[PDB]
Design a protein around this ligand. Structure first.
Ligand SMILES: NCCc1c[nH]c2ccccc12
Length: 195
């Protein structure tokens, strides 16, 4: 039952983490074998402002269907678990123009990160525990060769191996990212969630 609890990064430096963008390079979604509809290229853009708001905008592109989906996580600094890389966010699935399609609560747990290259995350919805995500994330489109070992270890903690995830860098050539929508939605106002 429920979302798994996983150990997370101690002394999480929010300032150094929530800036710039991330590419999702590898991931396991749920228990069943992955269908092509859930094989995507995801890039996200995020920020922490002085008011203490954290905002994270995702572009998810499915090469098989050649379609995009977008979602946004909203959180506040006081939603974090002390000094650890663990927090709850309201995540809103939205149209390109920001119109709300659906919303959910996501418990986020950062297993590890070096801030400037890679992070390893577990994301889960308490209302839909069957939807859980283990993700490898990079500051570049591919994982830097010199941190592969660090990523492998992090996945070790949670009973996983890289070759055990879907490698999104296999989509590779067909991958694309809606950078302009990312930038636009990040700056756009959402008074219903930014409160
Ligand atoms: N965009 C919804 C799932 C997701 C992927 N990576 C994340 C990092 C933090 C929060 C959610 C996520």
């Amino acid at each position: 039952s429920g979302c798994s609890t996983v150990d997370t990064v101690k002394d999480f430096n929010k300032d150094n983490f929530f800036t710039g963008s991330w590419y999702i390079t590898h991931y396991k979604l749920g228990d069943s074998t992955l269908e092509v509809g859930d094989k995507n290229c995801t890039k996200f853009l995020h920020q922490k402002t002085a008011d203490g708001k954290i905002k994270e905008v995702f572009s998810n592109y499915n090469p098989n269907a050649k379609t995009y989906s977008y979602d946004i996580s909203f959180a506040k600094v006081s939603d974090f678990d002390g000094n650890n890389g663990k927090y709850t966010a309201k995540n809103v699935i939205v149209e390109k123009d920001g119109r709300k399609i659906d919303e959910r609560t996501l418990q986020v747990s950062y297993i590890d990160t070096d801030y400037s290259k890679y992070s390893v995350v577990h994301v889960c919805d308490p209302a839909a525990p069957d939807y859980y995500l283990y993700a490898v994330q990079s500051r570049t489109e591919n994982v830097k060769e010199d941190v592969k070992s660090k990523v492998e270890a992090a996945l070790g903690k949670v009973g996983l191996k890289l070759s055990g995830l879907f490698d999104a860098t296999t989509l590779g050539n067909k991958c694309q990212y809606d950078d302009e929508t990312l930038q636009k939605l990040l700056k756009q106002s959402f008074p219903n969630y930014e409160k």
